Symmetry: C5
Subunit: 390 residues, 5 copies
């Protein structure tokens, strides 16, 4: 007479207590079968070490009070029952540090043998240990531990809806083209217990994610390479021009402000700084070495009246070995003699300055070649290190 | 006797179970008809790849328990019933990554034949794949998938309130003068199923939005064009002035800090960087070429005592082809001869410096003309590329 | 015997259905009277085009079930009834894009003739079209539309508690000394309908707000005026000092970084950039013109050995019109003749350089006077434009 | 037989209506006594003019239905009753602009004569007029107004739990070592009414808070003093060095970027800018005056061939008053005469340059002393202004 | 017949009042035992002085109404009861300034003797006094005070689940690899009372946390050390080069912008600035002393025509003590005499300049050695200060 669904709901939900664990025998536990599918990785924050993810969570447990024979209710084998009208296990993650805002699913499926299926999306804000030692190429290993917060293993036990390999290989609906790439979700079962009898069943899903380094390529490689290129270009200025040192100090200031600004996007952790800091300080050291070379050559070639003739050893070395590597008539005569003396003194000072300038030019050429070779070696080493990771 | 609305509500809502799917026959599904109208696009986030929109959502389904004959209730054909007192389908979006804060509508309209109409505004925070390859002019294609989270197609099915063309052409109440322009909302129906029998009905609304490029015109074109203009202006400084290199390095530092600052507003994605990065690095390369030309000409024209006479080939080439393209009396005599020798040496050095300066000036003029032509060609290419898109 | 309030509440709220529209005749609508008073303008966001305001909202409608005769209840004419125990119209704003967090008022006043008065504070996050074409002095015109989300005009109709002039003139409790100044709140009634019979009653309150320009006076006028002042000061440096160009380029870099930083506080919209951008780029053009003038004069006065005597036309023009507007004895003789020749050549080069320097100085004086006049004219024009708006 | 608490709760809460104002006579009001204790000042935002505070709020009113004789219930004189089971006045603050997240207290104490005590912590986000005219040393005067949102003075009246002096002197549990120091909380009672009969009782607590200036001492005084010190140091460079103007312009750029950056932490209001802006622009004007003095002296001492002998008046003044304040033999003769003429011309130019350099040096010394005296006077004035405030 | 759990729940929760404190005798209090385990320190905020932590909180109290004999219910000794169906003490923290978002645990364990165990995770936003006097190495001492907000010690009393040593030594599940290291959690019991009879029981957990200084090592030590190194490198430039002062001022500008930027990450408090500010201003003073030395030596060695011969005392001192520490024939003769006079004057000026340059060079060498020794002493002092803390 009455609709089958209405009669079934009246038969089930009448005198049904939602605060009672649904077992006819209190000794057996309610085995909750669990399944997790990753949807998206909303945020990985290396500063506070929290991982924000969106997952599709489903679970099913056998409710021994929501049972009926289909033949008495017009052959209905399953129906939807509100989640607030039945007992629901309190399965939640240990790693929680903040409650996620997720849509509330008001209905759950109940079968004629008691199986209750609960589908629900969950947004998770979980704490994790984020090691950024390989920051541009780091692969993270985050853990999600689903366990009952109160019930022991003798009340609520947790298993997997699907085989572990199927959960591992599930990468169908994951949002992929973001910053973080999901590798696998590995489920593992352990019994957490710090007491002889208080054993708690937990299910650990090791969410393994790999960062995509192409995000930071333009941000990191381009400015440093550009500034080394302009350093090489500016090395060509003559040392005695009087502007080479200004060029070098301006370039060093530019690199310093670049490093200080990029430090806002480079994370840090307690165990250690990311390894690319070593490369950045190596580039800083190369720029400082270039500046020191410029200052030394400027010292060599600067023309001041205290200059003395180039020593024999320095002259021979630089200009040979390094080069091959690379009556009132008497009263009238006195005034002319004095004028000639002054001109000779000026000419001798000019010649000494010329010799020092030649030595400085040869040394500058040699040191520029050495610096170019060092820069090429550093770039080749970086390229060959990047290649093996590919 | 009693008011018609009160009697109707008592007749309907008495012994009415809100946890039961409203069908007299459990085999037929409840066909939920759906309609979506876009109101505003609150935020498009290219970093986390989430789209925030506000939509006006209405749905109607046939409730087979909320039926009456109007003649028995003073000819009432419809009435408002609280949303919490009736069964409501759990239609929600798959793309959800965060629950939106939207006003709660407490009433729904119910007709005398069971049709229940639910009007509700929804704020959506949905994940989408944002491709910014054409960042200033990119058109996005975001999907909204409305489906029942639990019920299969044999329980809840989804259709459209209006024809697909009407939903596509709906741009009436959309907030238009913002950053993002709505092109169309294209509805499509698919059956999502990863099981033989567990088929789920879904309705996909492809929200297609086009960015307005005029937002970033002042931010991008103006600084680069201004810095190229000042580069052209500063190219006029004489190479031997001793300040041209300082001008060029200061300009390069300014452009570098501009690029680093503007990188904070330029988004990036895993698949690739926006194409305007190519244009920006081309402008950087042009500035670097200008600096290298300045340094080369400074090398040519710098006056130092090691200068040798201009070679025959270089002199002929630059100054012709490129130009057309563009007794104690004897003792007295000795001192005078020495003075004349010193003056002649200084004059010869000055003349050699003059020849080198002339060659450098001619080369600088030619290279300035070439650089101006290259800049004009680049600007014309950019303008003609912008024209075809208009 | 029993307290009058208890008896009255038992008489009213017993067998009272809160899901029924309170009319004895379903044909007549419930006329809801609305009054709105602005408290504060929490935030006006020109980027996402959302307006955040706090208002004091009160409404009253005639409930035909909450009626009694005072003489039967100890002459009680009004009482407070919980808001959750009575029917409340679902009046809410169309412009909503996010739900506002506002305190919940648990009680409403009910009179003996059915009038139910609902007082409630509301925080509103509404979308609006913000035109910043006159950004420092722009007056905004935001609309708040109160209407029933579900009920048509035949069920719920909306009017005004007070006359439109009284609502317009209400500026008593508004927080005034903030950034935004409230001009008026203009109420207007319209019938929103996109169907023959589905007519919806709405009440539009045009919130008109004017920005106070004194916020940005120090932020905008002071840096630009200061940098023009230092440009005028630095124009006094001699062109041949060798540091005027460095001064000008440093000043231009400072103005560029100022503009880039201040762009973070200058909003932009799709329809167009704020008009003060024109003034800012005019200041940029004036600085660039100053730099170009400095470079031109440096070109004129720079002393290099390729200098030729000043042409007759240029000399006459600049130095008149612009100025008015503003035997071994023979062997001994040969060496002396050669020395005299060298000294004469050097003196002639020095004299040519002196003539060119004089011409450059006169031209620099004239162009400095012209630039000062142009700057004064620009400042006077800005002051006059500001005065007429006052 | 039964427990005393259970019997008392059954006697009280049975047939008890929580929607009725608890008075046997509706003519008398429920006098709510209010006490407020400040816990912490979470945030004072001068931009949006909102004050965030945490307070400990307690109130007690006489409930005439929750009365019993202790002798009938095992001498129980008080008990805890859930807040949701009794009538609670809707006392809330007018100044609210956002609802505060505060813990919910589920129990209230009820005495045997009806006194109901409600203890609750409250987080308040209230709008206030923040005058920052004395920004580093400003004392704010914020108002908290507790009143019933609906009930008039004939229904709910408000008084103080403690005497006003006790509320004023309460600074025990306030968090003190933060940025803001609490001076006093002054309670005042007023009757808010804009109608003859609609009088509302309100209680205003004037929260008076004084900012601690030691927060911004390092941020403001240190950079300006340091840049003044380096300005004084750089004033010692010789004017003819050719780098003094570059030093001054670099220093000016540094101060400009410092001011622009510190503007991000200096708030502004509609009524007026903070007074320390005057001091900052005075420092800026001092730096500009130093730059102008440097440029003027550079103009005086610059050596160019157009220099003319120092005028008699300038020479006398600067160098006295300011200083005290601080045959082929004839053919042979012609060539020597010409050489002597050239040397004499060069020597005369050098002597004129020397005289101008001496005048410039004396003037530079005098102006440096004047500038040092002005800087010392400004620093002394600032110190003596700070002393009187201490 | 019926399931044991259902019968037990019916026996307990029937006619059970959840608003009544569960004691058969109202004179005895409900002794709540408290245990707290720290999970993670989400955020320590020194600006607003708030501490955000996640803790695992469990409590148990004896409910005298939830008691049964196991033999009558199939030997059930414990069961799970919903938290909303029983009386729960209102234990919450005094230090709260904002409510934390934590998962809600819906079940609590109840034993057959009345013991009710409540497990719950809590996110705490508590105010604390953060002293950053030793900012890089500071250890904080934050207090968490658990007490009943309403009930006095005669109603609810608080003790510890475990011994204080066990609570102190608990560092098992704390997230350790973050910025903050947990030292211990020290529980202490006090009776808070400001009245003769209104005594409140409270339990204080002194959360003691130590910051890990390795976070800021790269951010602080590296830039200052690098800028000192480049200062030492640039000290080698010859004083008469004309670019040493420009190098020094550019370096000072770089250090100034570094300090201004790093001030954004250096917190400040009312009681005092962090001690590393002293070291930073010492580095500033060292750089300023270097600049002043450079300016002084530039003054000494600058060549201008007003130079006078080096005084006897200065010459002797610097060049000895500091060095050891480190007829028409007559008409023909007149012209030659005049030429010789001019050449002699120029030579004498050159010789005076040479002597002054020698003195300046010796003084510059000595002062560079002194500055290097001072820098080495400062670095050694910093290293030895860091060693003793290790
Ligand atoms: O044995 S313990 O007292 C213990 C003793 C010493 C070190 C440690 Cl680390 C633990 N203990 C065991 C589980 C557990 C728990 N969980 C119950 C199961 N679901 C998650 C919450 N919360 C707690 C909250 C506060 C204090 C203790 C506990 C606790
Ligand atoms: O007389 S008024 O209409 C009036 C007329 C003209 C200017 C002004 Cl400023 C007020 N009026 C008086 C109190 C009051 C009120 N409070 C009731 C007491 N608790 C706080 C809220 N809310 C309102 C909300 C909207 C409109 C009016 C009011 C209002
Ligand atoms: O004696 S007091 O009036 C008092 C008098 C003078 C200075 C001080 Cl500092 C207190 N007083 C004692 C406890 C207490 C309290 N707690 C009850 C126990 N749990 C936490 C909240 N809230 C309050 C809220 C407002 C006003 C007073 C109190 C208060």
């Amino acid at each position: 007479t009455q609709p089958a669904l209405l009669r079934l709901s009246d038969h089930l939900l009448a005198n049904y207590k939602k605060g009672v664990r649904p077992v006819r025998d209190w000794r057996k536990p309610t085995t909750v079968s669990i399944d997790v599918i990753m949807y998206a990785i909303l945020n990985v924050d290396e500063k506070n070490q929290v991982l924000t993810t969106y997952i599709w969570y489903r679970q099913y447990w056998t409710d021994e009070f929501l049972q009926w024979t289909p033949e008495d209710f017009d052959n209905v084998t399953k129906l939807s029952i509100p989640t607030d009208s039945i007992w629901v296990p309190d399965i939640l993650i240990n790693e929680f540090v903040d409650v996620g805002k997720s849509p509330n699913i008001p209905y759950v499926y109940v079968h004629h043998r008691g199986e209750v299926q609960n589908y629900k999306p969950l947004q998770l804000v979980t704490a994790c240990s984020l090691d950024i030692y390989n920051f541009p190429f780091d692969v993270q290993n985050c853990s999600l531990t689903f366990t009952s917060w109160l019930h022991t293993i003798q009340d609520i036990n947790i298993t997997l809806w699907r085989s572990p390999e199927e959960v591992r290989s599930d990468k169908s609906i994951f949002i992929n083209q973001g910053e973080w790439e999901l590798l696998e979700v590995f489920p593992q079962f352990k019994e957490f217990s710090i007491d002889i009898s208080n054993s708690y069943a937990e299910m650990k899903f090791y969410v393994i994610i790999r960062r995509r380094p192409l995000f930071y390529a333009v941000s990191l490689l381009l400015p440093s390479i550009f500034l080394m290129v302009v350093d090489i270009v500016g090395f060509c200025l003559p040392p005695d021009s009087g502007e080479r040192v200004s060029f070098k100090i301006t370039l060093l200031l530019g690199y310093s402000v670049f490093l200080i600004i990029v430090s806002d996007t480079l994370p840090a952790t307690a165990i250690g700084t990311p390894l690319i800091g070593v490369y950045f300080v190596v580039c800083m050291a190369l720029l400082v070495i270039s500046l020191a070379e410029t200052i030394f050559i400027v010292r060599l070639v600067h023309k001041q009246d205290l200059q003395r003739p180039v020593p024999d050893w320095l002259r021979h070395l630089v200009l040979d070995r390094i080069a091959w590597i690379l009556l009132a008539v008497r009263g009238l005569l006195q005034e002319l003699s004095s004028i000639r003396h002054f001109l000779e003194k000026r000419d001798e000072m000019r010649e000494v300055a010329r010799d020092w300038l030649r030595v400085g030019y040869v040394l500058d050429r040699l040191l520029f070649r050495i610096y170019l070779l060092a820069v090429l070696a550093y770039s080749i080493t970086l390229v060959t290190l990047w290649s093996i990771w590919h």
